Amino acid sequence: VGKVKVENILIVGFKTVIICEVLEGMVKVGYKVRKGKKVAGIVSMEREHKKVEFAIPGDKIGIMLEKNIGAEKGDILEVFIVLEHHHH
Ligand code: NI
């Protein structure tokens, strides 16, 4: 299971941003992040303050979620893959 480590929570005007380090696996817009019994989807991601689609172990990213899940500095959050049946 993918994992990210929370470094900080930012409040940027109308946005709540989780700054985290990718520890394991791939992390992609559309995947879910879980803390305890709270799960939310990733709506958007930034790396180096530039909008990105996915991130890999070693990346420091900012993520915005569909809803807040109580993320705090030091939390190791699990990342759930969400299948995208595009019918290619
Ligand atoms: Ni892509």
Side-chain angles (χ1 to χ4, degrees), residues 6-22:
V6 183
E7 302 170 79
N8 267 310
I9 304 301
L10 308 182
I11 302 183
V12 183
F14 51 93
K15 318 195 314 196
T16 294
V17 180
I18 303 166
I19 300 294
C20 49
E21 179 185 354
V22 183

Side-chain angles (χ1 to χ4, degrees), residues 2-62:
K3 298 172 190 162
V4 300
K5 196 167 165 49
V6 183
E7 302 170 79
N8 267 310
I9 304 301
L10 308 182
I11 302 183
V12 183
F14 51 93
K15 318 195 314 196
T16 294
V17 180
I18 303 166
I19 300 294
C20 49
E21 179 185 354
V22 183
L23 300 177
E24 190 172 354
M26 275 208 42
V27 180
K28 193 165 175 302
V29 175
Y31 288 8
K32 314 297 206 183
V33 296
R34 178 186 72 86
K35 181 175 178 181
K37 305 307 193 180
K38 293 178 177 297
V39 179
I42 296 168
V43 170
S44 57
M45 187 184 304
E46 289 188 18
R47 189 176 42 241
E48 315 283 13
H49 318 102
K50 332 193 212 88
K51 197 107 288 169
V52 303
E53 186 188 8
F54 62 91
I56 66 177
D59 283 349
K60 310 288 210 178
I61 58 175

